[PDB]
Amino acid sequence: HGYVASPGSRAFFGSSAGGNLNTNVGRAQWEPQSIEAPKNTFITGKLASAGVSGFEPLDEQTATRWHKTNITTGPLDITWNLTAQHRTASWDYYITKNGWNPNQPLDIKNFDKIASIDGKQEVPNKVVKQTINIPTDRKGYHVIYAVWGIGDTVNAFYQAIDVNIQ
């Protein structure tokens, strides 16, 4: 189980692990690590919560709802913190396209896939640091969607991350 700690995920920032900076993240205030759903779950309006009961406040979406970490384009170091280390199948990353609507529910069709990293069925450390390429066209408020695919369960952990791209 785990979450993206850098840039802080939406769930992370709503929890004590992230300083309780985001408000009303439902269950993520107490269990940011538990956004667990089957692989290949990309339900419109349910990306941030992965459809998990009690995490629905994460699916709220306005231009001002969430804290947005400032980043640049180009290589971005992105760090997970794992509360339970599992053998890992994969790490996948997506980012919204310029012009996505920050006042409407999230839809994966409005994202591009930007990285896929093989986990090789290895057991990761509790801190996992990876580098992904933020496309150079991106500017403004965006959502990165990070997906940790577990090697020994049919599930993945899903992490929406709000950023402001300079």
PDB file of C-alpha atoms in Angstrom:
ATOM      1  CA  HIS A   1       0.000   0.000   0.000  1.00  0.00           C
ATOM      2  CA  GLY A   2       1.370   3.439  -0.593  1.00  0.00           C
ATOM      3  CA  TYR A   3       1.101   6.895  -2.040  1.00  0.00           C
ATOM      4  CA  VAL A   4       3.033   9.496  -4.014  1.00  0.00           C
ATOM      5  CA  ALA A   5       4.837  11.784  -1.606  1.00  0.00           C
ATOM      6  CA  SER A   6       6.730  14.010  -4.073  1.00  0.00           C
ATOM      7  CA  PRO A   7       5.217  16.015  -5.658  1.00  0.00           C
ATOM      8  CA  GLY A   8       2.711  15.369  -2.904  1.00  0.00           C
ATOM      9  CA  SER A   9      -0.381  13.543  -4.116  1.00  0.00           C
ATOM     10  CA  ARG A  10      -3.878  14.851  -3.548  1.00  0.00           C
ATOM     11  CA  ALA A  11      -4.483  12.143  -0.937  1.00  0.00           C
ATOM     12  CA  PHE A  12      -1.050  12.647   0.628  1.00  0.00           C
ATOM     13  CA  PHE A  13      -1.607  16.375   1.128  1.00  0.00           C
ATOM     14  CA  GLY A  14      -4.994  15.661   2.730  1.00  0.00           C
ATOM     15  CA  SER A  15      -3.413  13.393   5.356  1.00  0.00           C
ATOM     16  CA  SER A  16      -1.088  13.927   8.303  1.00  0.00           C
ATOM     17  CA  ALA A  17       1.727  12.539   6.147  1.00  0.00           C
ATOM     18  CA  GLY A  18       1.299  15.596   4.008  1.00  0.00           C
ATOM     19  CA  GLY A  19       0.511  18.185   6.664  1.00  0.00           C
ATOM     20  CA  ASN A  20      -3.249  18.278   6.211  1.00  0.00           C
ATOM     21  CA  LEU A  21      -2.931  20.945   3.532  1.00  0.00           C
ATOM     22  CA  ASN A  22      -5.758  19.669   1.315  1.00  0.00           C
ATOM     23  CA  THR A  23      -9.220  19.652   2.849  1.00  0.00           C
ATOM     24  CA  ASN A  24     -12.037  17.120   2.608  1.00  0.00           C
ATOM     25  CA  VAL A  25     -10.328  14.136   1.006  1.00  0.00           C
ATOM     26  CA  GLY A  26     -12.677  11.609   2.650  1.00  0.00           C
ATOM     27  CA  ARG A  27     -10.952   8.483   3.913  1.00  0.00           C
ATOM     28  CA  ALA A  28      -7.619   9.696   2.518  1.00  0.00           C
ATOM     29  CA  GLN A  29      -7.256  11.979   5.513  1.00  0.00           C
ATOM     30  CA  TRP A  30      -6.565   8.851   7.539  1.00  0.00           C
ATOM     31  CA  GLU A  31      -5.561   6.263   4.908  1.00  0.00           C
ATOM     32  CA  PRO A  32      -3.941   7.951   1.918  1.00  0.00           C
ATOM     33  CA  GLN A  33      -2.182   4.637   1.204  1.00  0.00           C
ATOM     34  CA  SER A  34      -5.412   2.693   0.576  1.00  0.00           C
ATOM     35  CA  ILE A  35      -6.579   3.823  -2.860  1.00  0.00           C
ATOM     36  CA  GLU A  36      -6.617   0.245  -4.157  1.00  0.00           C
ATOM     37  CA  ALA A  37      -8.662  -1.022  -7.149  1.00  0.00           C
ATOM     38  CA  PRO A  38      -8.335  -3.645  -9.850  1.00  0.00           C
ATOM     39  CA  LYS A  39      -5.788  -2.998 -12.580  1.00  0.00           C
ATOM     40  CA  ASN A  40      -7.342  -1.243 -15.553  1.00  0.00           C
ATOM     41  CA  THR A  41      -9.820   0.767 -13.502  1.00  0.00           C
ATOM     42  CA  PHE A  42     -10.180   4.156 -15.193  1.00  0.00           C
ATOM     43  CA  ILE A  43     -13.759   5.164 -14.416  1.00  0.00           C
ATOM     44  CA  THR A  44     -14.722   8.679 -15.462  1.00  0.00           C
ATOM     45  CA  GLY A  45     -15.237  10.851 -12.434  1.00  0.00           C
ATOM     46  CA  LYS A  46     -13.715   8.223 -10.209  1.00  0.00           C
ATOM     47  CA  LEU A  47     -10.003   8.429 -11.072  1.00  0.00           C
ATOM     48  CA  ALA A  48      -8.833  10.166  -7.885  1.00  0.00           C
ATOM     49  CA  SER A  49     -10.806   7.807  -5.631  1.00  0.00           C
ATOM     50  CA  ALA A  50     -10.362   4.733  -7.904  1.00  0.00           C
ATOM     51  CA  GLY A  51     -14.018   4.031  -7.114  1.00  0.00           C
ATOM     52  CA  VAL A  52     -13.149   3.059  -3.540  1.00  0.00           C
ATOM     53  CA  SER A  53     -15.951   3.628  -1.046  1.00  0.00           C
ATOM     54  CA  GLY A  54     -15.340   6.598   1.188  1.00  0.00           C
ATOM     55  CA  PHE A  55     -12.740   8.254  -1.041  1.00  0.00           C
ATOM     56  CA  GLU A  56     -15.311  10.024  -3.244  1.00  0.00           C
ATOM     57  CA  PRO A  57     -14.449  13.575  -1.978  1.00  0.00           C
ATOM     58  CA  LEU A  58     -11.155  13.173  -3.871  1.00  0.00           C
ATOM     59  CA  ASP A  59     -13.170  13.091  -7.095  1.00  0.00           C
ATOM     60  CA  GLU A  60     -14.371  16.642  -6.571  1.00  0.00           C
ATOM     61  CA  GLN A  61     -12.871  18.920  -9.205  1.00  0.00           C
ATOM     62  CA  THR A  62     -12.760  22.705  -9.369  1.00  0.00           C
ATOM     63  CA  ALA A  63      -9.979  25.081 -10.315  1.00  0.00           C
ATOM     64  CA  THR A  64      -9.466  26.044  -6.667  1.00  0.00           C
ATOM     65  CA  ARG A  65     -10.298  22.811  -4.811  1.00  0.00           C
ATOM     66  CA  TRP A  66      -6.810  21.347  -4.505  1.00  0.00           C
ATOM     67  CA  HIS A  67      -3.282  22.479  -3.657  1.00  0.00           C
ATOM     68  CA  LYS A  68      -1.064  22.426  -6.752  1.00  0.00           C
ATOM     69  CA  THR A  69       2.721  21.897  -6.517  1.00  0.00           C
ATOM     70  CA  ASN A  70       4.732  24.126  -8.837  1.00  0.00           C
ATOM     71  CA  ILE A  71       6.876  22.151 -11.279  1.00  0.00           C
ATOM     72  CA  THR A  72       8.587  22.714 -14.629  1.00  0.00           C
ATOM     73  CA  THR A  73       8.383  20.602 -17.761  1.00  0.00           C
ATOM     74  CA  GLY A  74      11.071  18.060 -18.540  1.00  0.00           C
ATOM     75  CA  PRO A  75      12.335  15.371 -16.191  1.00  0.00           C
ATOM     76  CA  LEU A  76      10.458  15.211 -12.889  1.00  0.00           C
ATOM     77  CA  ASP A  77      11.613  13.099  -9.954  1.00  0.00           C
ATOM     78  CA  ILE A  78       8.513  11.445  -8.490  1.00  0.00           C
ATOM     79  CA  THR A  79       8.764   9.554  -5.087  1.00  0.00           C
ATOM     80  CA  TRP A  80       6.435   6.960  -3.612  1.00  0.00           C
ATOM     81  CA  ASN A  81       6.269   6.066   0.067  1.00  0.00           C
ATOM     82  CA  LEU A  82       5.076   2.504   0.649  1.00  0.00           C
ATOM     83  CA  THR A  83       3.410   1.408   3.794  1.00  0.00           C
ATOM     84  CA  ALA A  84       3.461  -2.259   2.644  1.00  0.00           C
ATOM     85  CA  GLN A  85       6.130  -3.226   0.130  1.00  0.00           C
ATOM     86  CA  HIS A  86       4.825  -5.739  -2.489  1.00  0.00           C
ATOM     87  CA  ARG A  87       6.445  -7.371  -5.430  1.00  0.00           C
ATOM     88  CA  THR A  88       5.692  -4.940  -8.211  1.00  0.00           C
ATOM     89  CA  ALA A  89       4.495  -5.466 -11.798  1.00  0.00           C
ATOM     90  CA  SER A  90       4.527  -1.910 -13.077  1.00  0.00           C
ATOM     91  CA  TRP A  91       4.479   1.846 -12.554  1.00  0.00           C
ATOM     92  CA  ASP A  92       2.461   3.914 -15.037  1.00  0.00           C
ATOM     93  CA  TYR A  93       2.097   7.676 -15.336  1.00  0.00           C
ATOM     94  CA  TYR A  94      -0.373   9.882 -17.193  1.00  0.00           C
ATOM     95  CA  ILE A  95      -0.855  13.634 -17.368  1.00  0.00           C
ATOM     96  CA  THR A  96      -3.760  15.812 -18.447  1.00  0.00           C
ATOM     97  CA  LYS A  97      -3.600  17.524 -21.833  1.00  0.00           C
ATOM     98  CA  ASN A  98      -3.483  21.294 -22.051  1.00  0.00           C
ATOM     99  CA  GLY A  99      -7.070  22.563 -22.120  1.00  0.00           C
ATOM    100  CA  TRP A 100      -8.577  19.921 -19.898  1.00  0.00           C
ATOM    101  CA  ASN A 101     -11.433  21.353 -17.843  1.00  0.00           C
ATOM    102  CA  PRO A 102     -10.455  21.817 -14.181  1.00  0.00           C
ATOM    103  CA  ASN A 103     -14.122  22.273 -13.219  1.00  0.00           C
ATOM    104  CA  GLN A 104     -15.377  18.955 -14.552  1.00  0.00           C
ATOM    105  CA  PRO A 105     -14.903  15.334 -13.441  1.00  0.00           C
ATOM    106  CA  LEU A 106     -11.641  13.685 -14.473  1.00  0.00           C
ATOM    107  CA  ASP A 107     -11.737  11.480 -17.571  1.00  0.00           C
ATOM    108  CA  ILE A 108      -8.712   9.427 -18.666  1.00  0.00           C
ATOM    109  CA  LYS A 109      -9.404  10.319 -22.306  1.00  0.00           C
ATOM    110  CA  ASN A 110      -8.178  13.822 -21.380  1.00  0.00           C
ATOM    111  CA  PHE A 111      -4.740  12.454 -20.411  1.00  0.00           C
ATOM    112  CA  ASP A 112      -1.655  11.296 -22.274  1.00  0.00           C
ATOM    113  CA  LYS A 113       0.381   8.363 -21.027  1.00  0.00           C
ATOM    114  CA  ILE A 114       3.923   9.557 -20.322  1.00  0.00           C
ATOM    115  CA  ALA A 115       5.756   6.651 -18.635  1.00  0.00           C
ATOM    116  CA  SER A 116       5.578   2.931 -18.070  1.00  0.00           C
ATOM    117  CA  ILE A 117       8.244   1.356 -15.866  1.00  0.00           C
ATOM    118  CA  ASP A 118       8.576  -2.412 -15.474  1.00  0.00           C
ATOM    119  CA  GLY A 119       8.569  -3.493 -11.883  1.00  0.00           C
ATOM    120  CA  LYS A 120      10.221  -6.850 -12.699  1.00  0.00           C
ATOM    121  CA  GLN A 121       8.361  -8.572  -9.851  1.00  0.00           C
ATOM    122  CA  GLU A 122      10.795  -7.136  -7.440  1.00  0.00           C
ATOM    123  CA  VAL A 123      10.031  -5.908  -3.936  1.00  0.00           C
ATOM    124  CA  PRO A 124      10.695  -2.174  -3.845  1.00  0.00           C
ATOM    125  CA  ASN A 125      12.157  -0.207  -0.975  1.00  0.00           C
ATOM    126  CA  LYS A 126       9.801   1.797   1.225  1.00  0.00           C
ATOM    127  CA  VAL A 127      10.928   4.914  -0.650  1.00  0.00           C
ATOM    128  CA  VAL A 128      10.817   4.565  -4.459  1.00  0.00           C
ATOM    129  CA  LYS A 129      12.234   7.388  -6.625  1.00  0.00           C
ATOM    130  CA  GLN A 130      11.581   7.442 -10.378  1.00  0.00           C
ATOM    131  CA  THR A 131      11.962  10.010 -13.095  1.00  0.00           C
ATOM    132  CA  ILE A 132       9.277  10.820 -15.673  1.00  0.00           C
ATOM    133  CA  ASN A 133       9.282  13.272 -18.566  1.00  0.00           C
ATOM    134  CA  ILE A 134       6.728  16.053 -18.323  1.00  0.00           C
ATOM    135  CA  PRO A 135       5.926  17.039 -21.947  1.00  0.00           C
ATOM    136  CA  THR A 136       7.348  20.366 -22.891  1.00  0.00           C
ATOM    137  CA  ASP A 137       4.068  21.805 -24.130  1.00  0.00           C
ATOM    138  CA  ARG A 138       2.421  21.622 -20.721  1.00  0.00           C
ATOM    139  CA  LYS A 139       1.569  24.771 -18.792  1.00  0.00           C
ATOM    140  CA  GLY A 140      -0.742  25.652 -15.928  1.00  0.00           C
ATOM    141  CA  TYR A 141      -2.827  23.440 -13.665  1.00  0.00           C
ATOM    142  CA  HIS A 142      -2.472  19.748 -14.527  1.00  0.00           C
ATOM    143  CA  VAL A 143      -3.153  16.388 -12.930  1.00  0.00           C
ATOM    144  CA  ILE A 144      -0.589  13.601 -12.998  1.00  0.00           C
ATOM    145  CA  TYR A 145      -2.103  10.149 -12.510  1.00  0.00           C
ATOM    146  CA  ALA A 146       0.352   7.614 -11.073  1.00  0.00           C
ATOM    147  CA  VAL A 147      -0.499   3.910 -10.945  1.00  0.00           C
ATOM    148  CA  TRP A 148       1.449   1.304  -8.951  1.00  0.00           C
ATOM    149  CA  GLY A 149       0.576  -2.146 -10.334  1.00  0.00           C
ATOM    150  CA  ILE A 150       1.018  -4.884  -7.737  1.00  0.00           C
ATOM    151  CA  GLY A 151       2.869  -8.026  -8.753  1.00  0.00           C
ATOM    152  CA  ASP A 152       0.978 -10.514  -6.586  1.00  0.00           C
ATOM    153  CA  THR A 153      -2.541  -9.109  -6.486  1.00  0.00           C
ATOM    154  CA  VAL A 154      -4.837  -8.115  -9.373  1.00  0.00           C
ATOM    155  CA  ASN A 155      -4.930  -4.526  -7.999  1.00  0.00           C
ATOM    156  CA  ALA A 156      -3.102  -1.250  -8.356  1.00  0.00           C
ATOM    157  CA  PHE A 157      -2.770   1.860  -6.211  1.00  0.00           C
ATOM    158  CA  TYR A 158      -3.959   5.038  -7.901  1.00  0.00           C
ATOM    159  CA  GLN A 159      -2.587   8.496  -7.120  1.00  0.00           C
ATOM    160  CA  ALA A 160      -3.873  11.747  -8.576  1.00  0.00           C
ATOM    161  CA  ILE A 161      -1.337  14.574  -8.137  1.00  0.00           C
ATOM    162  CA  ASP A 162      -2.185  18.252  -8.679  1.00  0.00           C
ATOM    163  CA  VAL A 163       0.578  20.385 -10.190  1.00  0.00           C
ATOM    164  CA  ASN A 164       1.033  23.880 -11.609  1.00  0.00           C
ATOM    165  CA  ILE A 165       3.404  23.735 -14.536  1.00  0.00           C
ATOM    166  CA  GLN A 166       5.478  26.869 -15.012  1.00  0.00           C
TER     167      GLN A 166
END
